[PDB]
Design a protein around this ligand. Structure first.
Ligand SMILES: CCN(CCN(C)C)C(=O)CNCc1cc(C(N)=O)ccn1
Ligand SMILES: [Mn+2]
Length: 298
């Protein structure tokens, strides 16, 4: 029948004392959040970093996503370049035309149920566009940085030096890496995957409509992979996991019916989402938004 939402993942609202060091804070919430595989962190209300990207120079070519492509089992889609403004106008027009109502009036539960119906629907073909893996080096980070390429107002300095600035997260693993940008739209999505080297990942939503997340704890990772390889198409069964997780999209209720724990959440503007080592995660955007993510080491 209709989609059944997984239980909600933990939300943390640290005080200013607990918000000092991200690594220490993440270490303290670990015994809980590691059981859900993902968690949400709302910074104190007075923490409000400005958006540091250069908007007039921001240009990208998003990738075409067909929601039902796996159910359908190369001239279909014509790819186009956007600015931030022109993408937002296209994104907002798509959502309001699809649901026949203003974009901010569409309930998050309604986009969720419709997304998973469209994923499995062979009767309807919905095409969206996903701003994807845009390096922060070209346009600059969404956070103010001290690199000296622009700005840094006096009010901006504390955010450029903040440990919660994603450019300041430690990227280096001990042995004998820059943030990435995502311009989202309804329904654009990321499928089930883990980070390289089972790394942590932290994700910040600068502005826009929410990003919906699903996540699985690391102790269930093998269970997810077994259900995946069981129900995945045969041609992709023998593919290595690095190539497999490009196409692996599965209704969370299907995982839950096989006993795999799955947790959900809606990441709104100004909120962090942390994924723990080897925690499988997936999701989709509710609408036009801008997100920044980096893999970090502890
Ligand atoms: C740290 C960013 N990155 C690139 C690093 N790779 C070079 C390893 C990733 O793969 C992260 N995984 C993709 C992803 C996207 C989104 C999104 N579109 O909001 C949410 C969660 N995960
Ligand atoms: Mn990820």
């Amino acid at each position: 029948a209709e989609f059944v939402p997984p239980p909600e993942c933990p939300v943390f609202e640290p005080s200013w004392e607990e918000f000092t060091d991200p690594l220490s804070f993440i270490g303290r919430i670990r015994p809980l959040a590691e059981k859900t595989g993902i968690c949400k962190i709302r910074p104190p209300k007075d923490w409000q970093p400005p958006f540091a990207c250069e908007v007039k120079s921001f240009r990208f070519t998003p990738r075409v996503q067909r929601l039902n492509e796996l159910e359908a089992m190369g001239f279909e889609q014509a790819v186009r370049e956007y600015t931030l403004q022109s993408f937002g106008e296209m994104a907002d027009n798509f959502k309001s035309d699809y649901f026949n109502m203003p974009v901010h009036m569409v309930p998050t539960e309604l986009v969720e149920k419709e997304f998973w119906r469209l994923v499995s629907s062979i009767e309807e073909d919905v095409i969206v566009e996903y701003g994807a893996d845009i390096s922060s080096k070209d346009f600059g980070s969404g956070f103010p940085v001290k690199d000296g390429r622009r700005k840094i107002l006096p009010e901006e300095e504390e955010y450029a030096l903040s440990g919660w600035n994603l450019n300041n997260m430690p990227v280096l693993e001990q042995s004998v890496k820059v943030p990435w940008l995502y311009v989202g739209m309804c329904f654009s999505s990321f499928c089930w995957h883990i980070e390289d080297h089972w790394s942590y990942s932290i994700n910040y939503l600068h502005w826009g409509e929410p990003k919906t997340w699903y996540g699985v704890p690391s102790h269930a990772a093998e269970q997810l992979e077994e259900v995946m390889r069981e129900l995945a198409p045969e041609l992709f069964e023998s593919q290595p996991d690095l190539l497999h997780q490009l196409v692996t999209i599965m209704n969370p209720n299907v995982l839950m019916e096989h006993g795999v724990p799955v947790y959900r959440t809606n990441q709104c503007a100004g909120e962090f989402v942390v994924t723990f080592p080897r925690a499988y995660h997936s999701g989709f955007n509710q609408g036009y938004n801008f997100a920044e993510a980096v893999n970090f080491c502890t």
